[PDB]
Ligand binder design. Structure first.
Ligand SMILES: [Cl-]
Ligand SMILES: [Cl-]
Ligand SMILES: [Cl-]
Ligand SMILES: [Cl-]
Ligand SMILES: [K+]
Ligand SMILES: [Mg+2]
Ligand SMILES: [Mg+2]
Ligand SMILES: [Mg+2]
Ligand SMILES: [Mg+2]
Ligand SMILES: [Mg+2]
Ligand SMILES: [Mg+2]
Ligand SMILES: [Mg+2]
Ligand SMILES: [Mg+2]
Ligand SMILES: [Mg+2]
Ligand SMILES: [Mg+2]
Ligand SMILES: [Mg+2]
Ligand SMILES: [Mg+2]
Ligand SMILES: [Mg+2]
Ligand SMILES: [Mg+2]
Ligand SMILES: [Mg+2]
Ligand SMILES: [Mg+2]
Ligand SMILES: [Mg+2]
Ligand SMILES: [Mg+2]
Ligand SMILES: [Mg+2]
Ligand SMILES: [Mg+2]
Ligand SMILES: [Mg+2]
Ligand SMILES: [Mg+2]
Ligand SMILES: [Mg+2]
Ligand SMILES: [Mg+2]
Ligand SMILES: [Mg+2]
Ligand SMILES: [Mg+2]
Ligand SMILES: [Mg+2]
Ligand SMILES: [Mg+2]
Ligand SMILES: [Mg+2]
Ligand SMILES: [Mg+2]
Ligand SMILES: [Mg+2]
Ligand SMILES: [Mg+2]
Ligand SMILES: [Mg+2]
Ligand SMILES: [Mg+2]
Ligand SMILES: [Mg+2]
Ligand SMILES: [Mg+2]
Ligand SMILES: [Mg+2]
Ligand SMILES: [Mg+2]
Ligand SMILES: [Mg+2]
Ligand SMILES: [Mg+2]
Ligand SMILES: [Mg+2]
Ligand SMILES: [Mg+2]
Ligand SMILES: [Mg+2]
Ligand SMILES: [Mg+2]
Ligand SMILES: [Mg+2]
Ligand SMILES: [Mg+2]
Ligand SMILES: [Mg+2]
Ligand SMILES: [Mg+2]
Ligand SMILES: [Mg+2]
Ligand SMILES: [Mg+2]
Ligand SMILES: [Mg+2]
Ligand SMILES: [Mg+2]
Ligand SMILES: [Mg+2]
Ligand SMILES: [Mg+2]
Ligand code: NA
Ligand code: NA
Ligand code: NA
Ligand code: NA
Ligand code: NA
Ligand code: NA
Ligand code: NA
Ligand code: NA
Ligand code: NA
Ligand code: NA
Ligand code: NA
Ligand code: NA
Ligand code: NA
Ligand code: NA
Ligand code: NA
Ligand code: NA
Ligand code: NA
Ligand code: NA
Ligand code: NA
Ligand code: NA
Lengths: 237, 83, 56
RNA sequence: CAAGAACGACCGUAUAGUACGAGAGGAACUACGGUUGGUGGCCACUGGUGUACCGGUUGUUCGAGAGAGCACGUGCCGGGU
RNA sequence: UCGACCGAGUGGCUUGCUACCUCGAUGUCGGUUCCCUCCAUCCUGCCCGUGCAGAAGCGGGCAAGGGUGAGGUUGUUCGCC
RNA sequence: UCGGUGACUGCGACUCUCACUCCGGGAGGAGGACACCGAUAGCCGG
RNA sequence: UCGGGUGAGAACCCCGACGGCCUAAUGGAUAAGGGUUCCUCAGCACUGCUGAUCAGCUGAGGGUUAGCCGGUCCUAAGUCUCACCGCAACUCGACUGAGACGAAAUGGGAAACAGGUUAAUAUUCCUGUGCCAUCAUGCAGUGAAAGUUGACGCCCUGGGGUCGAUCACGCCGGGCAUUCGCCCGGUCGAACCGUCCAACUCCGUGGAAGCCGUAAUGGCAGGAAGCGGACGAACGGCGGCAUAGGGAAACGUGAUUCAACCUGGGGCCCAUGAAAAGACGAGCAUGAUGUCCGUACCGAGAACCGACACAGGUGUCCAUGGCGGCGAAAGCCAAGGCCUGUCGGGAGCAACCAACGUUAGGGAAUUCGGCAAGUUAGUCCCGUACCUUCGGAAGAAGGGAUGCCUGCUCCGGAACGGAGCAGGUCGCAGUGACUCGGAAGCUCGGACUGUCUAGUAACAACAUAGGUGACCGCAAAUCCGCAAGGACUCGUACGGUCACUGAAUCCUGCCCAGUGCAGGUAUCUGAACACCUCGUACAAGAGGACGAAGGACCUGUCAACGGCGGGGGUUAUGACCCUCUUAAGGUAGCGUAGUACCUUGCCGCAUCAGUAGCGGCUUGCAUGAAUGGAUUAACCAGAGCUUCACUGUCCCAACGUUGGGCCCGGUGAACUGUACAUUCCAGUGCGGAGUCUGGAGACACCCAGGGGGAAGCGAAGACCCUAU
RNA sequence: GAAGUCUGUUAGAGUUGGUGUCCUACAAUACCCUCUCGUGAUCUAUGUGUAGGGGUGAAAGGCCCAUCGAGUCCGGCAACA
């Protein structure tokens, strides 16, 4: 048959790529020398076209101006701090070690100095639970308990723009405009609505998969479609 | 009541129209500014809030200035002030 | 719209042009590559054994 | 020599409330009148057409008036040899 | 007047059988329009019988000149109304 | 065939750092003889 | 079309008149593309749907002038080169780094106007005037890089304001005029230099506790109005430029509406709307320099693409010419262009055909089906049902009005803007043409807008929001690459990926036996290396021990694939207990269905009559729950049915109009052709004969017709079988 | 003054019926009337990217220069039956 859609994706052609040239900033914690703090002032709040969430323009002391991942409740004129010694306030970035257990936190590094990885999307947060000289235990938005180096830096607060998904798109057009800002191919034709040549679920005199949807982890690309390595399906049971 | 959802005519069904009205009603309510306390805060765009009075511009929820999550942050700090 | 005569009307685009190297009108002014002699692709001149019968 | 169906069929009246029949009911020969289907022709009559013609009238252009052009092969409407 | 069983046939309108004709193609079903024909006759003409009083029928003979129309369902042919 | 004692190896359990890998501008940090990669074997594999 | 010109020759080459055609184009300027087609002279063998004295044809010659218009410079999505690395290798390959390329209408951008001129170029030449950049000199400065600009989405809207158009009133010229006195054109004048400034923002004063302000939002003791000031627009006003230029002349005043251009206010985003060179910041004068490339013409019913002078296709600007009217609509008419969507002449001009008009009475009887046609129509007033997601349904339906003339009223600053009143008055008809809905009901499907088989399918199919399940903590899940590497990703679970269902509403039952996925697993099974035994002076080989994933086995899971029967016991639908296969045994619903064989099921509605349609019943050949069930307002070039209205669809056809057809001049193909051929009725023959046989008929040639036959022409049958 | 809102041959896009005209065409997909959309998932120019078991596909096996259930060119090639 022919390569399936998920196979076209990997080639990285225009249709599948993010509109990266229209994106504003790669949001990463600024680097501090060591054993220090550094302060900046929030100059502006703007829209982040990669995230559909707001972002804060900060002007730092050493003269550096950059966008940062903004938690809720940050505004123009606010002073923000980054470092070991920074105050504990929404918008400040500190190592997990210096943060009080029980404080909500965002833009958490997976490895120290990586700029941050976890809990970056609208309204989300990580919950810092446990300290140690060894390990910091963090609960991620998915609910997973994550053991992290205490030297991993996080930002205090929950990510801004919470409640984004509360409103229905209501119409195809609204989805459309969002999808233009993303690395996605849209709209979505059901495999079952295709010809056999085009998809494992394609073909037949009526629409139906014609094989179980739960597919093995070991299945090759072009065959791995439907419910991948599903531990269960449905609702009940 | 249809609310702002009247712009939709007979389209889209009841849940979607109802939720868009409710969300947009609260979005368009008078909001008290975190700075000056006046009721002059409006939405500039997604998650972006501004006071027409003192000009303060700040981050908030997508459709409302303050979210339950964000309201918790402030508390969790003080609860950790005195261990 | 017919793929025939009606679609022929839109063809005002210049592609293949006289090539600086070989003189054929094969230099594709959008690719900057000559389809005849290989200019812009290859320092060596474009040539293939399939251009003649196998035994000559 | 050639062609034709150039005619086919029905209803009604007189016959007769007669013949027949207990009654109920109810014919025919013949002579008339009409209808239908087909056929050939014709245009006084009725009807259609009639961008021959005459009138009314909208828009616009020729300054108005008068008189006209265009509006699809008559702008439209009324009449019609 | 209806007419079983069994027996003998005629037609070539159905259906089946055969695989003789055409696969370098003989354009489908139904309908329509237009022409000619057959008779095993539905009506009309002339008759015979009657379980033929009359009237209305039923059955049969000769006979193919003319007629055999309009509609509702259905693509329908057919058929039902 | 009677036991203190090299080395080799089957076995499953463990700790290191020094290759190798990742993070870090760096100092260093996280991993670590695993993983990656090379070779081979079994299972699945329209 | 008439008359004329030229010529050997004139229907179509040219002049005049008359008559027409085009109005977002058939006019004006251009992009691509063409490439000399442009202009002139001389021609007619070629090309030109006829002819030609003409020409985009033939031959010769000529024609394109730039500091200011473009290119050039900048950067965009991207692209290439070199280095690095990969590859057996490269003209191949992804990253990273450096460099370069990448915009002629239509991104950014130093600077030009007016007049004149040629057969053919002109913001380019000529005249006049202006402007920019660089450099040199001199004066000033010595400030100089912070900042501003370049530089930005969509929707609504105010103010400023030019051209145009219009009004009023002068002047100049023209037209009409047997009457009226009206009608048309013009009334000019640039870049640039100087100057003015509304809005926004700000300052001082002031001191509002209900005022200020808007089309609207709004504003304010954190200081409103008012007053004063700072900064500060136009391709705009004003003055110069200008006794420059242009005009035959006059060579103009005011106004309204106001494209351009300027400058504000509001609203929207699960959407956030380039970048860089450059400019400003940063004075003046006098000189010098400003090279290189493009420039003709067409830009299309004959200069482009489509083999053609092809009815096709092909981007931008002129969206402000008049009447009309809501209008960039129709219709009519200017400016401008054309008679080249290029063969003509003749016949009341027949039949027949294309495209149309009218058609008495009837009114869907036509037909698969109202297919085709028709009806209705603009605007205002009245009035408006079921249903409904409360938005709709709705222009529901239905009813009335509509012109002209005379005099007025109201809103508004006013319109050559709008809404009314009274009186008069003509026609069959006042949205008088034109423009311009027919309406109502029942059922099915898909919720809706959207997508699709370029070229027989536009639908019920795809998409969609919405619902759901699955994978994944990012050194991830998923995917591309042989590799070097890469998309997702300037992303991080309110995220991506992978699937199913398909708005809303009420819902979504039972089954884990098989299959799939996933987890677990004492024991069983489970390969190779290493290890042990035998064998071999070594080796082949035979066996053993150990035991990964996987499997057996166990468990979870159906909004996973799918399944929901047969046969029996016992108060509408139905109830419960069983058995068997094979886990369960069809719940809520819906049901003769777009699913029902029997089938035109039965009953009812409707019709004279209804295999249709609708409702009810319903044992369902073979309904049923995200293989989603039921149902549903709104929507629909979707499928079926009914009613009113309408009508040449029909009864049943007629007459007329335009272009053909027919005759004449000129031009001038193709299909097809074994031969013979005036056939007809029968027969025969491989069973479907103009040609054989028997008869019949048959004088030759030509015109027009509608197509019975040549199993007519067109295509080595798509159906069907056969081919190792 | 909102809307993937309505009317609308504004421009522009699309292509339902006529199974009309054409069917050796004006045209190897045309003409006319009718019809749908026309502030948006809109239409469009120019530039640019994705390449053949590959792309692209709101999915029709649609489209990738009159070529598509695997483009085109040349070669294997005088393929084999
Ligand atoms: Cl999304
Ligand atoms: Cl018929
Ligand atoms: Cl140019
Ligand atoms: Cl305003
Ligand atoms: K055959
Ligand atoms: Mg990053
Ligand atoms: Mg969702
Ligand atoms: Mg919305
Ligand atoms: Mg995209
Ligand atoms: Mg889908
Ligand atoms: Mg399909
Ligand atoms: Mg497959
Ligand atoms: Mg389905
Ligand atoms: Mg399905
Ligand atoms: Mg094609
Ligand atoms: Mg060549
Ligand atoms: Mg006329
Ligand atoms: Mg009328
Ligand atoms: Mg035939
Ligand atoms: Mg007889
Ligand atoms: Mg006869
Ligand atoms: Mg295979
Ligand atoms: Mg010429
Ligand atoms: Mg001659
Ligand atoms: Mg000449
Ligand atoms: Mg780039
Ligand atoms: Mg360049
Ligand atoms: Mg430009
Ligand atoms: Mg010229
Ligand atoms: Mg100079
Ligand atoms: Mg020119
Ligand atoms: Mg022509
Ligand atoms: Mg005629
Ligand atoms: Mg009539
Ligand atoms: Mg009627
Ligand atoms: Mg009928
Ligand atoms: Mg009939
Ligand atoms: Mg119709
Ligand atoms: Mg007034
Ligand atoms: Mg039905
Ligand atoms: Mg639909
Ligand atoms: Mg098609
Ligand atoms: Mg359609
Ligand atoms: Mg179609
Ligand atoms: Mg669908
Ligand atoms: Mg979904
Ligand atoms: Mg979803
Ligand atoms: Mg029924
Ligand atoms: Mg019945
Ligand atoms: Mg279920
Ligand atoms: Mg025979
Ligand atoms: Mg003979
Ligand atoms: Mg054959
Ligand atoms: Mg077949
Ligand atoms: Mg709309
Ligand atoms: Mg419309
Ligand atoms: Mg055709
Ligand atoms: Mg393009
Ligand atoms: Mg198919
Ligand atoms: Na399938
Ligand atoms: Na037979
Ligand atoms: Na044959
Ligand atoms: Na037939
Ligand atoms: Na007879
Ligand atoms: Na019938
Ligand atoms: Na001519
Ligand atoms: Na000025
Ligand atoms: Na006008
Ligand atoms: Na629409
Ligand atoms: Na199961
Ligand atoms: Na199972
Ligand atoms: Na089922
Ligand atoms: Na539609
Ligand atoms: Na007619
Ligand atoms: Na014939
Ligand atoms: Na059409
Ligand atoms: Na291929
Ligand atoms: Na070959
Ligand atoms: Na073969």
């Amino acid at each position: 048959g022919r390569r399936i859609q998920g196979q076209r994706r990997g080639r990285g052609t225009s249709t599948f790529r993010a509109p990266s040239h229209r994106y504003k900033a790669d949001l990463e914690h600024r680097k501090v020398e060591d054993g220090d703090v550094i302060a900046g002032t929030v100059v502006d709040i703007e829209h982040d076209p990669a995230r559909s969430a707001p972002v804060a323009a900060v002007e730092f002391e050493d003269g550096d101006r950059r966008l940062i991942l903004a938690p809720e409740g940050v505004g123009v004129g606010d002073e923000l701090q980054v470092g070991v010694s920074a105050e504990i306030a929404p918008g400040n970035t500190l190592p997990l070690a210096e943060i009080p257990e029980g404080v909500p936190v965002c833009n958490v590094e997976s490895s120290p100095g990586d700029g941050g990885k976890f809990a970056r999307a609208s309204g989300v947060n990580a919950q810092l639970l446990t300290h140690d000289r060894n390990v910091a235990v963090v609960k991620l938005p998915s609910g997973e308990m994550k053991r992290l180096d205490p030297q991993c830096r996080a930002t205090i607060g929950v990510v801004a723009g919470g409640g984004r998904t509360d409103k229905p798109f209501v119409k195809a057009g609204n989805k459309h405009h969002k999808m233009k800002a993303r690395g996605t191919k849209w709209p979505n034709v059901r495999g079952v609505a295709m010809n056999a040549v085009d998809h494992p679920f394609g073909g037949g005199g009526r629409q139906h998969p014609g094989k179980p949807k739960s597919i093995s982890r070991n299945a090759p690309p072009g065959r791995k479609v439907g419910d991948i390595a599903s531990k269960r399906t449905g609702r009940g049971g | 009541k249809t609310g702002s959802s009247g712009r939709f005519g007979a389209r889209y069904g009841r849940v979607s129209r109802r939720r868009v009205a409710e969300i947009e009603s609260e979005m368009n309510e008078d909001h008290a500014c975190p700075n000056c306390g006046e009721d002059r805060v409006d939405r500039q765009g997604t998650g972006i809030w501004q006071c027409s009075y003192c000009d303060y511009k700040f981050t908030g929820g997508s459709y409302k200035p303050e979210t339950p999550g964000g309201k918790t942050v402030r508390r969790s700090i003080r609860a950790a002030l005195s261990e | 719209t017919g793929a025939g005569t009606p679609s022929q009307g839109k063809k005002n685009t210049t592609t293949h042009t006289k090539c600086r190297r070989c003189g054929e009108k094969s230099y594709h002014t959008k690719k900057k590559v000559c389809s005849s002699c290989g200019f812009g692709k290859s320092a060596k001149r474009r040539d293939y054994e399939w251009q003649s019968k196998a035994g000559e």
